[PDB]
């Protein structure tokens, strides 16, 4: 099967460094050159790096020259991203892709994109959130995830019975450097008293995992 | 250098109908010119290439024309999951580089709906740590401009609340926004009203929630 995956993400302190890999699988690896692109949280692609099939040339954006370098192990079906110097700007979702030209130097098209790595610079370090109860003919209540890094968390209601009116909404960076973000469920007045709501927040980087009770 | 604009930013339109999105360039890139989709949370993945080519495996409903510095791609008949991001991508020779559009997002349009408006002090919890968030939650609203602005004993807050907004539901097509209002523990106990003002299409006056407590 056709594909890219990638891996080397994970969180970095500003002036660090960091080495993505992107392993290619059911193509010719060696005939196509190759590219990384990222996507800035809530921002748009940002090309990054090409190298050629045979690895003879390479270029590079001007916001990452000289602290980044594209290389390639064609003997492993291997791309790589060594990122020197990082700065909070470089954080974003790396991809890797492909480009659509078959033994061709003039690169143009990314026609086989990978899942994309999360790579987040700050000087922040891996914490776990607070979770703290949003208390409440239609009521509302929630919970608010707060100050915990990198992202994502998750969350669900009732262990994931209750989906219905409920909205999770994309977290902020606050000015400390860490996360927060709310999530809320809006129910009828009546179930307020005949229904328990708790919500069940997961934050994988820190192994956390909080179940709170949101009571009226 | 090539600058791709993109236009509209947001399209808004009704499943099944034609959509229709503008790229254009800064100088000339013949038909070199393509587009990707980017669905929520997933990665892009190419639609058209050379300006009208379709990617291995794209439905005909994709179709891409122009040359020189005029491009749309066409999407005969939207499903679902083509309320996306779509952007048209180019080469740069001054520098080397792929430039890419800005972007378009696809909205289904619906009919003005209010926010409904609810007001969350902090919890005794949370107070015990030093801090104090105030959230207030605008739900179920369309078009997504909303304005909220706090207001703490009738002073108008500035610079110390953040917000953010949903993706627009796939069963209602509203959006609901969240702003959180930060404060020390200290200054929360100084001030008795807290209050989010709400503006929006659907309100013809500001609607306040409010409590008294801190």
């Known amino acids: 099967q056709v594909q890219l995956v990638e891996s080397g993400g994970g969180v970095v302190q500003p002036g660090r460094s960091l080495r993505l890999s992107c392993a290619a699988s059911?193509?010719?690896?060696?005939?196509?050159?190759m590219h990384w692109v990222r996507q800035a949280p809530g921002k748009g692609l940002e090309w990054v790096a090409v190298?050629?099939?045979?690895?003879?040339?390479?270029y590079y954006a001007d916001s990452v020259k000289g602290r980044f370098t594209i290389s390639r192990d064609n003997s492993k079906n291997t791309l790589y991203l060594q990122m020197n110097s990082l700065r909070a700007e470089d954080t974003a979702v790396y991809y890797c892709?492909?480009?659509?030209?078959?033994?061709?130097?003039?690169?143009?098209?990314?026609?086989?994109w990978g899942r994309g790595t999360l790579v987040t610079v700050s000087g922040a370090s891996t914490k776990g959130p607070s979770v703290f109860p949003l208390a409440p003919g239609t009521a509302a209540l929630g919970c608010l995830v707060k100050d915990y890094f990198p992202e994502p968390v998750t969350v669900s209601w009732n262990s994931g019975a209750l989906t219905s009116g409920v909205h999770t909404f994309p977290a902020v960076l606050q000015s400390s450097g860490l996360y927060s973000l709310s999530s809320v469920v809006t129910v009828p007045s009546s179930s307020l008293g005949t229904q328990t709501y708790i919500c069940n927040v997961n934050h994988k980087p820190s192994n956390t995992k909080v179940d709170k009770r949101v009571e009226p | 250098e090539i600058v791709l604009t993109q236009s509209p930013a947001t399209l808004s339109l009704s499943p099944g109908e034609r959509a229709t999105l503008s790229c254009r360039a800064s100088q000339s890139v013949s038909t070199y010119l393509a587009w990707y989709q980017q669905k929520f949370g997933q990665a892009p993945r190419l639609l058209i290439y050379?300006?009208?080519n379709r990617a291995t495996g794209i439905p005909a409903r994709f179709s891409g024309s122009g040359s020189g510095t005029d491009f749309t791609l066409t999407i005969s008949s939207l499903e679902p999951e083509d309320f996306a991001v779509y952007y048209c991508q180019c080469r740069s020779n001054w520098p080397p580089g792929i430039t890419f559009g800005q972007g378009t997002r696809l909205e289904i349009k619906r009919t003005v709906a209010a926010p409904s408006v609810f007001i969350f002090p902090p919890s005794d919890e949370q107070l015990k740590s030093g801090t104090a968030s105030v959230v207030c939650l605008l739900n179920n609203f369309y078009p997504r401009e909303a304005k909220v602005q706090w207001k703490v004993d009738n002073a108008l807050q500035s610079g110390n609340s953040q917000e953010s907004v949903t993706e627009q539901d796939s069963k209602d097509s509203t959006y609901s926004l969240s702003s959180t209002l930060t404060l020390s523990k200290a200054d929360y106990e100084k001030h008795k009203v807290y209050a989010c003002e709400v503006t929006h299409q659907g309100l013809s006056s500001p609607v306040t929630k409010s409590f008294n407590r801190g």
């Open positions: 892709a492909r480009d659509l030209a078959y033994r061709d130097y003039v690169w143009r098209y990314f026609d086989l």
């Open positions: 050379d300006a009208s």
């Open positions: 190298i050629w099939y045979d690895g003879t040339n390479t």
């Open positions: 059911g193509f010719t690896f060696s005939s196509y050159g």
